[PDB]
Design an enzyme around this catalytic site. Sequence first.
Site, mmCIF file in Angstrom:
data_model
loop_
_atom_site.group_PDB
_atom_site.id
_atom_site.type_symbol
_atom_site.label_atom_id
_atom_site.label_comp_id
_atom_site.label_asym_id
_atom_site.label_seq_id
_atom_site.Cartn_x
_atom_site.Cartn_y
_atom_site.Cartn_z
ATOM 1 N N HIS A 1 0.796 -1.230 0.000
ATOM 2 C CA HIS A 1 0.000 0.000 0.000
ATOM 3 C C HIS A 1 0.830 1.283 0.000
ATOM 4 O O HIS A 1 0.359 2.336 -0.430
ATOM 5 C CB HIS A 1 -1.124 0.032 1.026
ATOM 6 C CG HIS A 1 -0.680 -0.041 2.444
ATOM 7 N ND1 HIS A 1 -0.206 1.053 3.137
ATOM 8 C CD2 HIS A 1 -0.688 -1.071 3.322
ATOM 9 C CE1 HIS A 1 0.080 0.700 4.376
ATOM 10 N NE2 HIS A 1 -0.210 -0.585 4.517
ATOM 11 N N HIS B 1 6.471 6.856 6.024
ATOM 12 C CA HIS B 1 5.989 6.503 4.704
ATOM 13 C C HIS B 1 5.312 7.719 4.126
ATOM 14 O O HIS B 1 5.178 8.743 4.780
ATOM 15 C CB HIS B 1 4.991 5.361 4.760
ATOM 16 C CG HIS B 1 3.810 5.705 5.606
ATOM 17 N ND1 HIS B 1 3.811 5.569 6.984
ATOM 18 C CD2 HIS B 1 2.637 6.292 5.295
ATOM 19 C CE1 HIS B 1 2.677 6.037 7.471
ATOM 20 N NE2 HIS B 1 1.933 6.459 6.459
ATOM 21 N N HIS C 1 1.992 9.146 1.304
ATOM 22 C CA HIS C 1 0.793 8.954 0.519
ATOM 23 C C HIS C 1 0.907 9.905 -0.657
ATOM 24 O O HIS C 1 1.304 11.051 -0.466
ATOM 25 C CB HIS C 1 -0.476 9.263 1.332
ATOM 26 C CG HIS C 1 -0.596 8.497 2.613
ATOM 27 N ND1 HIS C 1 -1.381 7.371 2.717
ATOM 28 C CD2 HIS C 1 0.023 8.637 3.809
ATOM 29 C CE1 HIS C 1 -1.316 6.897 3.954
ATOM 30 N NE2 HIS C 1 -0.433 7.618 4.632
ATOM 31 N N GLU D 1 -3.440 13.537 2.161
ATOM 32 C CA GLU D 1 -4.601 13.074 2.931
ATOM 33 C C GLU D 1 -5.242 14.258 3.659
ATOM 34 O O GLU D 1 -6.387 14.639 3.400
ATOM 35 C CB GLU D 1 -4.130 12.004 3.907
ATOM 36 C CG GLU D 1 -3.655 10.790 3.133
ATOM 37 C CD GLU D 1 -3.668 9.536 3.909
ATOM 38 O OE1 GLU D 1 -3.034 9.484 4.989
ATOM 39 O OE2 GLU D 1 -4.231 8.566 3.404
ATOM 40 N N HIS E 1 4.303 10.887 6.458
ATOM 41 C CA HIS E 1 3.924 10.532 7.832
ATOM 42 C C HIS E 1 5.110 9.930 8.530
ATOM 43 O O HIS E 1 5.523 8.815 8.195
ATOM 44 C CB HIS E 1 2.749 9.519 7.834
ATOM 45 C CG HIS E 1 1.477 10.124 7.358
ATOM 46 N ND1 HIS E 1 0.381 9.375 6.981
ATOM 47 C CD2 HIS E 1 1.146 11.419 7.172
ATOM 48 C CE1 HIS E 1 -0.580 10.192 6.593
ATOM 49 N NE2 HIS E 1 -0.151 11.439 6.728
ATOM 50 N N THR F 1 -4.872 6.498 8.979
ATOM 51 C CA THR F 1 -5.627 6.773 7.754
ATOM 52 C C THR F 1 -5.713 5.573 6.849
ATOM 53 O O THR F 1 -6.328 5.670 5.780
ATOM 54 C CB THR F 1 -4.995 7.892 6.963
ATOM 55 O OG1 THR F 1 -3.679 7.491 6.593
ATOM 56 C CG2 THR F 1 -4.916 9.195 7.793
ATOM 57 N N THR F 2 -5.122 4.442 7.254
ATOM 58 C CA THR F 2 -5.420 3.142 6.640
ATOM 59 C C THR F 2 -6.008 2.200 7.670
ATOM 60 O O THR F 2 -5.800 2.374 8.872
ATOM 61 C CB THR F 2 -4.148 2.455 6.095
ATOM 62 O OG1 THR F 2 -3.351 1.964 7.188
ATOM 63 C CG2 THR F 2 -3.308 3.408 5.316
HETATM 64 N N1 IT5 Z 1 2.279 0.600 8.394
HETATM 65 C C1 IT5 Z 1 1.442 1.002 9.065
HETATM 66 C C2 IT5 Z 1 0.317 1.537 9.969
HETATM 67 C C3 IT5 Z 1 -0.301 0.378 10.783
HETATM 68 C C4 IT5 Z 1 -0.573 -0.875 10.126
HETATM 69 C C5 IT5 Z 1 -1.122 -1.939 10.823
HETATM 70 C C6 IT5 Z 1 -1.425 -1.777 12.220
HETATM 71 C C7 IT5 Z 1 -1.176 -0.536 12.859
HETATM 72 C C8 IT5 Z 1 -0.621 0.545 12.168
HETATM 73 C C9 IT5 Z 1 0.877 2.544 10.851
HETATM 74 C C10 IT5 Z 1 1.162 3.856 10.187
HETATM 75 N N2 IT5 Z 1 0.101 4.194 9.242
HETATM 76 C C11 IT5 Z 1 -0.381 5.512 9.165
HETATM 77 S S1 IT5 Z 1 0.382 6.810 10.040
HETATM 78 S S2 IT5 Z 1 -1.323 5.951 7.764
HETATM 79 C C12 IT5 Z 1 -0.251 3.189 8.263
HETATM 80 C C13 IT5 Z 1 -0.718 2.036 9.054
HETATM 81 ZN ZN ZN Z 2 0.107 7.360 6.617
#
Ligand code: IT5
Ligand code: ZN
Length: 257
Positions: free
Chosen positions: A61, A91, A93, A103, A116, A195-196
């Site tokens: 993703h 990461h 987006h 986002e 992020h 946000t995912t």
């Molecule tokens: N990689 C990852 C995340 C995740 C994945 C599975 C379980 C808990 C957290 C942490 C950081 N994320 C955001 S700040 S958008 C993307 C999702």
């Molecule tokens: Zn993110």
Amino acid sequence: HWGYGKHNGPEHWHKDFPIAKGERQSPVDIDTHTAKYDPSLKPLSVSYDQATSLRILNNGHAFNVEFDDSQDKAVLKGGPLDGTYRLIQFHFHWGSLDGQGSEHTVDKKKYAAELHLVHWNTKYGDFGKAVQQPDGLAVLGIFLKVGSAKPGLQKVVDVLDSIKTKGKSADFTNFDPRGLLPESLDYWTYPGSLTTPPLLECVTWIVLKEPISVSSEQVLKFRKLNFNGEGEPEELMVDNWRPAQPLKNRQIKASFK
Ligand SMILES: N#CC1(c2ccccc2)CCN(C(=S)S)CC1
Ligand SMILES: [Zn+2]
């Protein structure tokens, strides 16, 4: 499984993740005229001098640049935060076109991408515990606009060929995330979520006002990644962003006037 396509995208996520329609979901639009300056907010403290990057992973993703978070090596504190939050990964987006990809939005403006930098509250001992807490994570969000190149991003761009497809990883040591920060640390802050999926409501968002500039060539290289695995039909990794969610019962605070 969830993703960003027509059939498994953000409008579908609530079926497996009902919290998608929750009370503190992210991202949101930041209405700059309605955000209130909070003079009690402390300046942010971003302490990345001892950061230890380890690896970069295409997780199907996005791509995650992972850090050693088994000690307080790179930490975020201050601002709206109580305590110490350890950097675990960053990461991005991004979009298929320069006019979309972020986002968070600012007065409905979309940026080309959004970084992020993910941190977890050390009082909870591990990241898995932290995401189960309302103050478990602090995510530093930084907008990207297309213009001049960001030199400190280039080492990331140049390794992407080696992790083109889902599940691929590569060694990625000695990367300094200070090279991804803008000059100013002025920010907006509000309580929200990942946000995912799993969309957990565990994030104190700290979104920097000043975007960084990246070149068209840099963002074009993000768009050559693949959501698919090796040996599968190519699906370009683009538009891996969730749109703005209802603000509901929240106030966005500004660190600046
Ligand atoms: N990689 C990852 C995340 C995740 C994945 C599975 C379980 C808990 C957290 C942490 C950081 N994320 C955001 S700040 S958008 C993307 C999702
Ligand atoms: Zn993110």
